[PDB]
Design an enzyme around this catalytic site. Structure first.
Site, PDB file in Angstrom:
ATOM      1  N   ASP A  62      30.650  58.367  37.266  1.00 35.75           N
ATOM      2  CA  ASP A  62      31.647  57.756  36.403  1.00 35.75           C
ATOM      3  C   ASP A  62      31.106  56.479  35.767  1.00 35.75           C
ATOM      4  OD1 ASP A  62      33.583  59.755  36.736  1.00 35.75           O
ATOM      5  OD2 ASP A  62      34.598  58.743  38.372  1.00 35.75           O
ATOM      6  N   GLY A  63      30.248  55.747  36.480  1.00 40.47           N
ATOM      7  CA  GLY A  63      29.689  54.526  35.918  1.00 40.47           C
ATOM      8  C   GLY A  63      28.796  54.788  34.718  1.00 40.47           C
ATOM      9  N   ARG A 147      36.515  28.729  43.366  1.00 41.32           N
ATOM     10  CA  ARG A 147      37.854  28.184  43.446  1.00 41.32           C
ATOM     11  C   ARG A 147      38.814  29.078  42.678  1.00 41.32           C
ATOM     12  NH1 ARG A 147      37.641  21.661  43.921  1.00 41.32           N
ATOM     13  NH2 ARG A 147      39.768  22.182  44.598  1.00 41.32           N
ATOM     14  N   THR A 177      42.058  53.925  38.444  1.00 43.42           N
ATOM     15  CA  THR A 177      41.418  54.380  39.666  1.00 43.42           C
ATOM     16  C   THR A 177      40.165  53.584  40.026  1.00 43.42           C
ATOM     17  OG1 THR A 177      40.299  56.125  38.370  1.00 43.42           O
ATOM     18  CG2 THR A 177      42.282  56.747  39.543  1.00 43.42           C
ATOM     19  N   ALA A 178      39.796  52.565  39.248  1.00 48.36           N
ATOM     20  CA  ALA A 178      38.593  51.785  39.553  1.00 48.36           C
ATOM     21  C   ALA A 178      38.938  50.440  40.222  1.00 48.36           C
ATOM     22  CB  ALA A 178      37.766  51.602  38.269  1.00 48.36           C
ATOM     23  N   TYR A 179      38.558  49.304  39.624  1.00 41.57           N
ATOM     24  CA  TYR A 179      38.862  48.007  40.236  1.00 41.57           C
ATOM     25  C   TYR A 179      40.355  47.842  40.555  1.00 41.57           C
ATOM     26  CZ  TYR A 179      37.458  43.163  41.214  1.00 41.57           C
ATOM     27  OH  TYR A 179      37.150  41.956  41.794  1.00 41.57           O
ATOM     28  N   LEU A 181      42.660  49.882  41.328  1.00 40.08           N
ATOM     29  CA  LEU A 181      43.093  50.619  42.512  1.00 40.08           C
ATOM     30  C   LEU A 181      42.712  49.886  43.801  1.00 40.08           C
ATOM     31  CD1 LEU A 181      44.495  53.316  43.170  1.00 40.08           C
ATOM     32  CD2 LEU A 181      42.231  54.247  43.734  1.00 40.08           C
ATOM     33  N   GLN A 237      30.416  44.943  32.311  1.00 38.49           N
ATOM     34  CA  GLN A 237      29.135  45.027  31.608  1.00 38.49           C
ATOM     35  C   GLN A 237      28.963  44.014  30.476  1.00 38.49           C
ATOM     36  OE1 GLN A 237      28.313  49.465  30.668  1.00 38.49           O
ATOM     37  NE2 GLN A 237      30.085  49.565  32.038  1.00 38.49           N
TER      38      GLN A 237
END
Ligand SMILES: NC(=O)c1ccc[n+]([C@@H]2O[C@H](COP(=O)([O-])OP(=O)(O)OC[C@H]3O[C@@H](n4cnc5c(N)ncnc54)[C@H](OP(=O)(O)O)[C@@H]3O)[C@@H](O)[C@H]2O)c1
Ligand SMILES: NC(=O)c1ccc[n+]([C@@H]2O[C@H](COP(=O)([O-])OP(=O)(O)OC[C@H]3O[C@@H](n4cnc5c(N)ncnc54)[C@H](OP(=O)(O)O)[C@@H]3O)[C@@H](O)[C@H]2O)c1
Ligand SMILES: NC(=O)c1ccc[n+]([C@@H]2O[C@H](COP(=O)([O-])OP(=O)(O)OC[C@H]3O[C@@H](n4cnc5c(N)ncnc54)[C@H](OP(=O)(O)O)[C@@H]3O)[C@@H](O)[C@H]2O)c1
Ligand SMILES: NC(=O)c1ccc[n+]([C@@H]2O[C@H](COP(=O)([O-])OP(=O)(O)OC[C@H]3O[C@@H](n4cnc5c(N)ncnc54)[C@H](OP(=O)(O)O)[C@@H]3O)[C@@H](O)[C@H]2O)c1
Lengths: 283, 283, 289, 289
Positions: A62-63, A147, A177-179, A181, A237
């Protein structure tokens, strides 16, 4: 139109380039013209791809598909994914069924799935300070600072809230469904016209994700009282530094990605195998 | 049409009936016809309401509005909410600003917000075993059993997964801030055409909520290998017992609820005050 | 009897600077010997008081008063825990898990403590040691937490976890928070961790937005030794941060060893201090009925 | 030396019944005295073996073998903990947090234990006492958890929490899970609780889908006494459930007092038993690299 076929890979895998060698020989024996990615071509002796190919095959996870989608989306060229062995949300074709699947698509048996992307625009006043597309997510985060940062959120010009947090994840259905999720957000079906907003490590415990209409415009104002310069990342990216008081404006791009799947594609099957959900009950 | 005004309350509060006495006197002095709910009328000496009133005012919390919405939605009658002192997601008018607000609406200054409801239909084969509407949620749960239950989920005829859990919360955008929110679900903007599916205390840790298109049809199959009879609850008020192997079919009702708010209504203001989210930044 | 009083304050806020001036006058008017931390004294010249380093303040003070809130209490605790010198915190405005004294009530509340009326408890700290093979690559204590994270990188990092030398798991995540009971209400809480009562002899391990959805916090006995191995296949150098304030760059393959520090922080409070009241008002929890 | 062996099995599954037959033959062929629990014996007549109650099995057995998985281990533990009789679990098929013996490997694994090769650890239990004023309204032990919930009602319930007599908070929720380290991987885990290593002397308190979003699990010292007061303004009778298997109806105003039981369960495992391996395979966690 399927005459000029482009191939993109992610380097560093035996198994990747093996899939690559198998794919090239399968298309050449179909008398099709095959164009290798400049960087992948240096690993087997023997950005502009969307402009000349009628179809681009992405080999990788997927990446790998993520990196290729922003370029291919603006050029209106269809994209087909081959995974590394197990289903991915964006790569449906297993390497060992390459010949059957890919030949099925080239012959005309395939389903088309538009996916929408986001436009991120950083501004200082009216001056543009960076623009990037994103198939998965636009993420505001502290960069190298350890911080918490502080920001305000507006949706369609209406004030939502301020908060202290590590940042914010703004995700498409693809990015749900990535970060997002991992950060606690819901899964959003790929055909849903919606955007999810997921706070990252919020100070306020009652912080919760919000799902808004896909045609909504988001505006993040970085707090002018901050002393550090946070970052905005598109699909992890493309990166932009923000100054205190800068704004980040996020909305859906008009040109969506033309993603191809074999005819047997099943979105929920992908959820079950990737996430381990239960299959049909037995006795 | 605003001539026949109905009033519903939740009993057991001084402050409720005080708001009631103030409202009646305000509308009578406007030469309007006022119809009290049969049960509220027994607390102050001196279901069919949607059929005769051109406007129904609900006094109470979001819970009071919930009970009244299913009846009023099918009769196409507009509904106005007065809270008990603080904003609710469905009740925007504070008791002490009753005269200003309510008079504003009767004079013609108001915003209309359609909210959609869900239809829950329990079936054994093709035989109906109970039907109920829900403004917030349709909840499958174990009833009096203290054991986990087991079920399959289908969306538009496609198998999603089976799972072991206490049950399932299926919520509208209105219900996204109620049970579903406590169970970990996202907030869904009231104008979003979406339904959220939230597993209750799932055995599988990778279980996560799913947001689907609002026009999607959901089907829950209660596991035929179970030994206990779970329950289905609509808005926590209408209940049905399910046998192993029964199906629960859930989709959006055609007739939506005509909810009225004053012109200054602000959905995000409500989120900030109810959930404690940060207000605009200072110096 | 408190004779020699140190003052530690986190510079920056203007109101913090005023609170230190009021605290100075108050202690000198009680005929006590005030000692200013090196940097603080340089921010307000003309004081004419003995100064010393943060690191040595505990060797010469009976009591240290810390201005500037919970975050400022962490740096104070790291210097003073090895000296067994009790620490007293003053809020920046709102109450905290480590400071119960509003600047509004400075003279009354610090007076009560100086007059012998107080609560004292101890809090343990973590000791983090980075190693590259058998070479030491950085050591730091922490009152709240030791956090492995990607630094400026946006990628997930890969690591293995060992507890008392037993392999627990490897995973891909933003990082890992290791927290004391004190730190359980800070970064770990925002990452989904549980609250740990300060009396509990336990350490909590909280994966930071793990890729594996079944990953979950684990609470282990407080005398456990934790080992995090940074995957040798990383292409970025992760960071280890103690209390978000002291940082070490890790190479792929480096290990981070974390355990409880023998010397505990001695924390003084006014007698009216109530940990659950702190939870109720800082977290919003409901009260009686 | 294990001479007298009891067998406890949770009736229902057909494969459980076969596993008990294989276990019976195995122990008798080693010339050992087998003792069948009252109900189990009634399910398979003709055995000709001594029988006894669950409650007394611990007074007369050197070792008890439990067939039927983790849930069945809870009922066994509640009977046998007061007798200091070690307990050994056999899976229903898949491994569990309390049973590490596949029915496939019954003879080899139980043989090893009988031949003196095993791991033994102790697990503490909770003791729950319902009171109406100063009158006792029901007592039950629990290896996993004591759970306050609405029973058949769909409404939220309102309660207050006290720890060692100190008011913590009141809230509106589905209920409250109070769990041992053993129970931390069961209902509490599904409700968002943390994992607690079995060696940890701690109790976890997990609100069940609380209305207050800032509500969070709290971990307290294992010697703490918990007090839950059912709001006197409830219009339904909530339920208190120990291990999901023993139940008491509470009135509005009733209190539930929960603390650690002095007598601990003695849990035997094959020598190959590995708690983290159990976590890795039951929860899916990543392994080496
Ligand atoms: N804690 C987290 O979960 C976290 C943290 C930072 C970034 N990210 C994600 O990583 C993305 C950037 O990828 P990358 O440049 O760093 O290269 P990458 O290593 O190839 O991608 C990171 C991982 O996310 C998976 N992934 C990517 N898109 C996904 C999607 N739509 N749904 C489910 N999984 C997806 C990838 O799958 P494959 O293995 O098949 O390639 C990979 O496992 C970002 O858009 C961000 O969402 C996640
Ligand atoms: N997303 C997050 O939750 C996040 C991210 C990075 C760091 N942190 C925390 O920040 C700590 C460093 O403090 P900082 O002021 O230098 O950095 P900071 O990021 O600027 O602020 C941390 C905030 O947490 C509060 N805090 C500190 N210790 C706490 C505790 N034991 N319990 C509850 N709240 C606590 C601080 O309160 P005061 O205002 O009184 O100082 C401050 O509001 C780190 O140990 C880490 O735990 C949290
Ligand atoms: N753990 C939970 O959160 C939980 C458990 C069971 C049921 N519920 C909810 O309770 C509903 C049934 O209400 P009821 O018959 O039991 O009477 P009720 O006591 O008046 O309502 C229960 C509470 O939920 C609030 N509420 C209702 N609808 C809401 C919404 N759309 N958004 C945010 N909050 C909302 C009510 O607000 P007011 O105080 O202003 O009346 C009340 O605090 C169900 O639809 C279910 O969602 C929640
Ligand atoms: N939504 C939920 O998560 C939920 C709801 C109700 C009860 N429970 C748990 O069920 C317990 C009663 O067991 P039951 O079989 O009679 O009821 P059950 O609801 O039929 O099944 C409980 C499941 O949890 C497993 N389990 C039991 N103890 C466990 C532990 N300490 N760690 C991890 N998993 C464990 C059981 O494994 P086996 O298959 O090996 O028996 C079973 O699969 C209660 O103590 C409660 O914790 C969980």
């Amino acid at each position: 139109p399927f005459r000029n076929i482009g191939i993109i890979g992610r380097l560093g895998s035996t198994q990747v380039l093996d899939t690559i060698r198998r794919l090239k020989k399968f298309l050449i024996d179909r008398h099709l013209h095959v164009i290798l990615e400049d960087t992948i071509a240096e690993v087997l002796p023997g950005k502009i791809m969307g402009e000349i190919c009628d179809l681009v095959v992405v080999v990788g996870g997927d990446g790998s598909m993520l990196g290729a989608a922003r370029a291919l989306a603006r050029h209106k060229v269809p994209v087909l994914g081959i995974n590394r062995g197990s289903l991915g949300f964006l790569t449906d074709i297993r390497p060992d069924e390459l010949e059957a699947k890919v030949g099925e698509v080239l012959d005309g048996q395939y389903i088309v799935e538009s996916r929408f992307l986001l436009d991120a625009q950083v501004r200082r006043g009216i001056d543009s300070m960076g623009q990037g597309d994103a198939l998965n997510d636009v993420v505001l985060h502290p960069g190298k600072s350890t911080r918490m940062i502080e920001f305000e959120l507006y949706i369609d010009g209406q004030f939502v809230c301020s908060q202290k947090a590590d940042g914010l994840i703004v995700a498409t259905p693809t990015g749900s469904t990535a970060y997002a999720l991992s950060a606690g957000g819901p899964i959003m079906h790929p055909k849903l016209d919606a955007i999810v907003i997921v706070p990252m490590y919020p100070h306020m415990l009652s912080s919760r994700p919000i799902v808004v209409d896909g045609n909504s415009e988001l505006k993040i104002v970085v707090s002018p009282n901050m002393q550090i310069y946070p970052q905005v990342s598109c699909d992890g990216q493309n990166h932009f530094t923000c100054a205190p008081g800068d704004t980040v404006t996020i909305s859906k791009k008009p040109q969506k990605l033309r993603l191809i799947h074999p005819i047997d594609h099943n979105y929920y099957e992908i959820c079950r195998t990737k996430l381990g959900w239960g299959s049909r009950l037995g006795g």
